[PDB]
Write a protein that binds this ligand. Structure first.
Ligand SMILES: Nc1ncnc2c1ncn2[C@@H]1O[C@H](COP(=O)(O)OP(=O)(O)OP(=O)(O)O)[C@@H](O)[C@H]1O
Ligand SMILES: Nc1ncnc2c1ncn2[C@@H]1O[C@H](COP(=O)(O)OP(=O)(O)OP(=O)(O)O)[C@@H](O)[C@H]1O
Ligand SMILES: Nc1ncnc2c1ncn2[C@@H]1O[C@H](COP(=O)(O)OP(=O)(O)OP(=O)(O)O)[C@@H](O)[C@H]1O
Ligand SMILES: Nc1ncnc2c1ncn2[C@@H]1O[C@H](COP(=O)(O)OP(=O)(O)OP(=O)(O)O)[C@@H](O)[C@H]1O
Lengths: 265, 580, 315
């Protein structure tokens, strides 16, 4: 476990400790991910979607589900380790260092046998240690045969630019679309997240505040995507209220949006 | 051997242990590999083919055949070793570690004599040690002192191997082609014994036939023998997780989840909704019975399975007067199909006046700025294969831009600047045109028939015959009647009342108010926009004045009435009264 | 190879095989078959492509259908054809995707999307459909292929088209006073000469103008179009049979010489296909029974402005 802990972060342990935010309304996406992970070969889902729609939140919710034990028997008590390529490529100065580290990580995973790798920003896996032999080339034989469960995550544009330019690697990952939630789903997400933000900012957020945040964020802010597009308004209104001082209402959300976009709402 | 085991994986041992999947139908490829391997010199075959077609499976089948003994006397007892370049490179910290390792491996192969190397992903061999492994191996390959198989994709082969002509000359290309549907069905029949055993389910012949056919038809970026197996594996995994049999319905559901194209079976609610599709669309579109019927017929044909597999789901030209609902119908269709108007892929062709803007659709050619960004339309259709595409006011686009969509209309395909072919066979294409609306000089003897003839003549005049020939339907919209305007007053007032109710205010209009609004906002020539302007000037402005003046506030039931009218009220005046 | 007896007899009756999918157009099928047989017999010119044809004539008559049928015959799949869709090559600078970008520029590693395809499969059918709407630079580039059989891509490599069959399908070319097909042929030839350079046309092996479909050809093609629907229904465990009255009426309603066979296609679509879809959804006809289409209120000869199709489902 030592080799893994120095090149990655145990997401299941964090979920057990309660460090991950609740995930609401992603039952279908998590079920689809579990379905792909239970395959016999090529059991490597990749979460694809616009930036900010909840790609990493889906994996965090999967970790929480694994901790709670609601997952099927195949994924029961599996440890979800998020891999950080920066750590792998940090000390690799001489020839063979990066390959040695990656091979050691894979050997440890195989020996333990109860580990699911998670690679957010999977496009960084293409040509990581070299222009050639790199992380992708080393992983390809393991990924193809289904001996190494992995959950990738990328955006649409990054997937098209990098992953699709390497057909051999792109063949080994099953796309799992995650879409921008509707306004009602965003309201449910905000209601679920309310507790953590209230605790952090020591403020009270009303239901009208959540509804206003979701609706206004959908209506006015244009270049962003709803989940974070609305959590931003909620969090910034809470920050304003805490700085001034203890309640957040639709008026505060409207003020935050007006400062953001300049539209006098 | 010890070194070979350290730096490689024994495939013959795995085949003896039964760890390799069966290989079906690749007798010709295995035979040709055997032929090339037995040559006197340059006996180094390389399998080149698209990803997922079974290049590694061919070598696995060759190892299985060698284990069984159905091979010529040359390869009667050869041991097939897959080489791991990563294992060689890893740990080669010093100057001579990698070259020493490679030399030791080659010496061991030469001494034992019965080993056949398999360099999977041969393109990675060009610069493994950077002296790189390619330079070290080159002398051995040419003289036939080292029997080696290679495997690479066509693109990787061209990009990397063909750069070094000397290295390329020493490898014999063996072409592995994408199997046909029947070959894939045979492959699935072969693999079922293991897949169902792993998933603890039962897979029927119908399920495998459906998997092969659907994967071939609907998934276009993959290659058949692998996409079909993915469908089967996902269906089996779903059956294992839910709790067992896997049928064609499961494969259809898996494909529908994968690509988003609704191929799964129709439920009672879904079929009932489809049957009443005209009524559902009429909840938002008033009048225009013919256009709604045409769109509903197209969608029902697509969902019932009678669609033409080649052409798109349906191509329409919505022409006619202005303000009658040409764009609104497409928006309502998108809402019905996907539940949100924003699901519509809308292209405003008014911005395509200049011809050089055609590259905005399929991107820029190679070697030009913006080449890597693809196209605005091709990528959007690729991400959502089943979608409604709306070309708004196509008549304003350059004549050279609507000539680029002929293959889209007929063959249902569009090639972007990068060479990717994007299929349109599942989309619904709607071109909205206003031709023949600006508008008899001499003595003249329905009006709708004359309008239809004028619009059709204008369409023929503008578009070339080969464009109008490919279009499923050309629908000319009627002008709105007084009854339709009266009905649409309710829609517009509901639009306003939603905003008011967001403020905790309920808006009620007496029938007299609705009649007066219909009377004032009815102009047959200008369509339904004058009614919108009238409602805006008579209601929205007055309501805003009232709200900002605090005359009516939250919790009040605003009621609108007409006072100085009886039943042409130029003197009629609206009165807004609020009560708790 | 050594032409086997089966392969030799298949080649001998190539016209019959092609006509199973193509109705009419005897001259074009004969020309294509003659080119293929000449190539296979070993008498082809060693320094020119295996054949170069310009299909022209009326719309919706089978200019691209013949190319697809030829590709299907030669290789057993319509997808073996290399289709370029020249409609999107209007811009001058867009030729770089036929031959690739020059070295040192973005996207040069990928080569061209035509030269690479031909290089991978030297023996293949290439279809430059709607050639008239490409820029003149593309014609100048393809002049080299026509004259010498080799083409130079961006990287500088030469790819040989000597074993390739090139087909250019064009819609180019589509009476004052008292007067009492050859006219169409002459008009098409005049338009072709006006548009293309004389030497470009001189290098083309054949220029074929397709005949407009006649009533008998439409009658024959009704069965061919209905075969697709029958096969599609077969997957649902339902068989479709049209009585001779139904076929006669479909031919009568869908026959219009100027617009070709597409009107018949949309007539089949809106007359039986959509009604069958509605009935299947409503479950009036289901798996395990045969659907017989018939016609009533029709005298059998007069136009059926009142005749209506009727579907009967019998176990
Ligand atoms: N279903 C959800 N439930 C609860 N919170 C969510 C949900 N979806 C998104 N969030 C919130 O959205 C915010 C951002 O989402 P996320 O962490 O997934 O970014 P992302 O998808 O990785 O975008 P990118 O990949 O471009 O960086 C998170 O704070 C997360 O708490
Ligand atoms: N003839 C075949 N018989 C049985 N299974 C096959 C056959 N061909 C392909 N498969 C299946 O195709 C799947 C994909 O693996 P494949 O052998 O194609 O690797 P590959 O061709 O090297 O792909 P890549 O280009 O990414 O390296 C195999 O798991 C195998 O089950
Ligand atoms: N048949 C209709 N049914 C319901 N609403 C309609 C109808 N026609 C017009 N409207 C109203 O008119 C407004 C815009 O109409 P629309 O854009 O569809 O006209 P149009 O067909 O695009 O005319 P043009 O494009 O030539 O200007 C919509 O808000 C819509 O509410
Ligand atoms: N001679 C024909 N024989 C069989 N089917 C035909 C024939 N002509 C047309 N069809 C039918 O018409 C459909 C399309 O015809 P096709 O595209 O080949 O004509 P075209 O020459 O390309 O006209 P244009 O390119 O000018 O639009 C075919 O799918 C086919 O079903």
């Amino acid at each position: 476990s030592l080799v893994l802990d120095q090149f990655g972060r145990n997401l299941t342990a964090a979920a057990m400790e309660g460090k991950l935010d609740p995930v609401i309304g992603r039952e279908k996406e998590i079920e689809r991910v579990m379905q792909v992970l239970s395959r016999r070969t090529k059991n490597n889902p990749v979460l694809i979607g616009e930036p900010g729609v909840g790609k990493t939140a889906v994996v965090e919710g999967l970790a929480q589900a694994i901790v709670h034990g609601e997952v099927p028997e195949t994924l029961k008590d599996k440890q979800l380790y998020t891999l950080d390529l920066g750590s792998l490529v940090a000390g690799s100065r001489y020839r063979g260092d990066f390959e040695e580290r990656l091979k050691k990580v894979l050997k440890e995973i195989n020996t333990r046998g109860d580990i699911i790798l998670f690679i957010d920003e999977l496009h960084t896996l293409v040509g990581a240690g070299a222009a050639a032999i790199d992380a992708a080339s080393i992983l390809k034989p393991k990924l193809a045969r289904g001996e190494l469960q992995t959950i990738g995550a990328t955006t649409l544009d990054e997937y098209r630019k990098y992953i699709e330019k390497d057909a051999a690697l792109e063949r080994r990952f099953q796309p799992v679309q995650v879409g921008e939630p509707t306004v009602e789903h965003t309201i449910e997400i905000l209601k679920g997240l309310r507790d953590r933000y209230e605790a952090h900012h020591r403020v009270s957020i009303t239901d009208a505040a959540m509804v206003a945040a979701a609706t206004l964020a959908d209506r006015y802010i244009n270049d962003r995507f709803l989940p974070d597009k609305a959590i931003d308004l909620i969090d910034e209104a809470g920050a304003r209220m805490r700085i001034r001082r203890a309640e957040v209402d639709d008026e505060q959300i409207a003020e935050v949006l007006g400062n953001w976009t300049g539209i006098p709402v | 051997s010890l070194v070979l085991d350290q730096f490689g994986r024994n495939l013959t041992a795995a085949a003896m242990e039964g760890k390799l999947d069966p290989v079906i139908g690749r007798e010709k490829e295995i035979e040709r590999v055997m032929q090339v391997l037995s040559r006197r010199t340059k006996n180094n075959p390389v399998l080149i083919g698209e990803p997922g077609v079974g290049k590694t499976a061919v070598v696995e089948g060759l190892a299985q055949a060698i284990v069984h003994g159905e091979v010529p006397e040359t390869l009667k007892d050869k041991q097939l070793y897959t080489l791991d370049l990563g294992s060689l490179v890893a740990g080669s910290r010093y100057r001579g570690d990698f070259e020493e390792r490679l030399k030791k491996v080659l010496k061991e192969i030469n001494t034992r004599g019965d080993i056949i190397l398999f360099i999977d992903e041969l393109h990675t061999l060009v610069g493994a040690g950077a002296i790189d492994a390619a330079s070290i191996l080159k002398p051995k390959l040419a003289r036939g002192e080292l029997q080696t198989i290679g495997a690479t994709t066509l693109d990787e082969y061209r990009k990397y191997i063909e750069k070094d002509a000397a290295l390329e000359r020493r490898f014999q290309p063996v072409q592995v082609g994408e199997p046909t549907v029947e070959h894939t069905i045979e492959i699935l029949k072969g693999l079922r014994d293991r897949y169902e055993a792993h998933h603890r389910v039962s897979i029927t012949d119908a399920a495998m036939v459906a998997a092969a056919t659907l994967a071939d038809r609907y998934i276009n970026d993959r290659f058949l023998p692998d996409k079909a197996i993915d469908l089967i594996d996902e269906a089996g995994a779903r059956m294992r997780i839910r709790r067992a049999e896997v049928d064609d319905e499961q494969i259809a559901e898996v494909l529908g989840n994968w690509t988003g194209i609704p191929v799964f079976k129709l439920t009672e609610a879904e079929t009932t909704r489809l049957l009443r599709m005209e009524e559902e669309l009429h909840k938002r579109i008033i009048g225009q019975e013919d256009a709604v019927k045409a769109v509903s017929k197209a969608i029902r044909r697509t969902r019932a399975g009678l669609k033409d597999p080649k052409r798109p789901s349906g191509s329409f030209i919505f022409a006619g007067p202005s303000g009658v609902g040409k764009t609104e119908l497409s928006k309502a269709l998108a809402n019905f199909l996907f539940g949100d108007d924003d699901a519509l892929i809308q292209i405003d062709m008014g911005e395509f006046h200049d011809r050089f803007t055609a590259s905005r659709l399929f991107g820029a050619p190679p070697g030009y700025v913006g080449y890597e960004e693809g196209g605005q339309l091709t990528e959007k259709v690729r991400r959502k294969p089943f979608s409604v595409v709306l070309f708004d006011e196509i008549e304003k686009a350059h004549q050279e831009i609507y000539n680029s969509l002929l293959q889209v209309l007929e063959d249902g395909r569009l090639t972007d600047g990068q060479g990717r072919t994007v299929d349109f066979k599942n989309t619904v294409l709607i071109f909205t045109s206003n031709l023949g609306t600006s508008d008899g000089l001499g003595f003249s003897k329905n009006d709708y028939e004359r309008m239809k003839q004028k619009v059709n003549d204008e369409l023929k005049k503008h578009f070339r015959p080969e464009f109008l020939n490919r279009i499923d339907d050309i629908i000319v919209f009627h002008q709105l009647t007084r009854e339709e305007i009266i009905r649409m007053v309710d829609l517009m007032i509901s639009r306003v009342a939603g905003q008011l109710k967001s403020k905790d205010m309920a808006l009620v209009l007496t029938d007299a108010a609705k009649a007066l609004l219909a009377k004032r906002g009815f102009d047959p020539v200008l369509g339904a926009r004058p009614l919108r302007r009238t409602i805006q000037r008579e209601i929205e402005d007055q309501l805003s004045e009232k709200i900002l003046f605090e005359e009516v506030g939250p919790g009040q039931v605003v009621t609108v009435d007409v006072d100085n009218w009886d039943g042409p009220g130029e003197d009629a005046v609206f009165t807004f009264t609020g009560t708790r | 190879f050594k032409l086997t007896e089966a392969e030799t007899t298949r080649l001998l009756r190539m016209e019959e095989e092609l006509h199973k999918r193509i109705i009419g157009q005897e001259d074009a099928v004969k020309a294509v078959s003659k080119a293929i047989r000449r190539t296979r017999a070993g008498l082809k010119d060693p320094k020119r492509p295996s054949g170069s044809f310009i299909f022209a004539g009326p719309s919706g008559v089978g200019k691209t259908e013949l190319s697809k049928a030829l590709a299907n015959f030669l290789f057993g799949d319509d997808d073996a054809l290399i289709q370029i869709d020249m409609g999107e090559f209007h811009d001058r600078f867009t030729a770089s995707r036929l031959f690739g970008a020059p070295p040192g520029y973005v996207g040069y590693e990928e080569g061209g999307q035509l030269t690479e395809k031909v290089r991978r499969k030297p023996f293949s059918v290439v279809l430059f459909d709607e050639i008239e709407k490409a820029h003149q630079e593309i014609y100048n580039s393809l002049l080299q292929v026509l004259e010498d059989g080799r083409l130079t891509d961006g990287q500088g490599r030469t790819v040989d088209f000597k074993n390739t069959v090139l087909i250019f399908t064009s819609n180019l070319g589509t009476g004052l006073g008292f007067s009492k097909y050859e006219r169409m042929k002459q008009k098409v030839n005049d338009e072709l000469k006006k548009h293309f350079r004389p030497e470009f046309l001189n290098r083309i092996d054949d220029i074929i103008v397709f005949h407009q479909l006649t009533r008998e050809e439409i009658i024959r093609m009704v069965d061919l179009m209905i075969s697709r629907v029958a096969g599609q229904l077969k997957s649902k465990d339902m068989a479709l049979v049209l009585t001779d009255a139904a076929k006669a009426l479909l031919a009568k309603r869908g026959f219009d010489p100027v617009l070709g066979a597409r009107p018949l296609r949309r007539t089949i679509q809106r007359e039986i296909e959509d009604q069958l879809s509605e009935k299947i959804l409503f479950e009036e006809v289901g798996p395990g029974q045969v659907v017989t289409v018939d016609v009533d209120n029709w005298d059998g000869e007069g136009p059926g402005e009142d005749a209506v199709f009727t579907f009967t489902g019998t176990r």
